């Protein structure tokens, strides 16, 4: 506490602190821009994040 | 593997109050954003209302204060309580299921007709 997390898909963020922010973990932004090659989804993730619940925030970070 | 069955809706007269409901199945719900889009007779899909997994409502300016969107976790249903309807609100109302996980898929319902006359 706080423990660095490595998700299956090889993303990194500091749990839980990186999920308690208005912005999503920077690892998820990069993944969506470069790997998924879809920058509009990354900017669309930024818009949903503040209104998301913690459970959804965790779920998204784990599987993205 | 994700079902969206909408119910309610019909024909009401101006000033009335209709209620739309949409039920989801086949995946998660509590950790999902649901909402409603409507397409007027000659127009294109238009945002009406959103509600996030955290329970945060977003409304379009035209329908704000009149329409109210709510969700029922544990029943896998989202409700849109329309009040003081107007002829311009006549449109096919579609359900929305906004799930991320894999990388943002968006699912729609088949639609429910809503017509306001007089």
Residue numbers in the entry:
A (entry chain B): 632 to 695
B (entry chain A): 1 to 118
What did the publication describing this PDB structure actually write?
Each sdAb recognized nucleoprotein (NP), a critical viral structural protein enveloping the RNA genome as part of the viral ribonucleocapsid and also a vital component of the viral assembly and replication machineries in concert with VP35, polymerase L, and VP30 (25). The last 64 residues of NP visible in the crystal structures primarily consist of three alpha helices associating to form an upper V-like shelf of the two C-terminal most helices (arbitrarily named 1 and 2 counting back from Leu695), with the third descending between them to re-appear after a turn as beta sheet positioned under the C-terminus.
The pivotal CDR3 aromatic residue of each sdAb appears nestled toward helix 2 Asp679 and close to Leu676 plus Val691 borne on helix 1 and Met683 on the turn between helices 1 and 2. sdAb A and B dispose Trp100 almost at right angles to each other while sdAb C employs Tyr100. While only Arg106 of sdAb A salt bridges Asp679, sdAb B employs Arg98, Arg50, and Arg58 to engage Glu675 plus Asp679, Asp679, and Asp682, respectively. The values calculated for sdAb B and C complexes were averaged over the four complexes in each asymmetric unit, while values for the sdAb A complex were calculated for the single complex in its asymmetric unit.
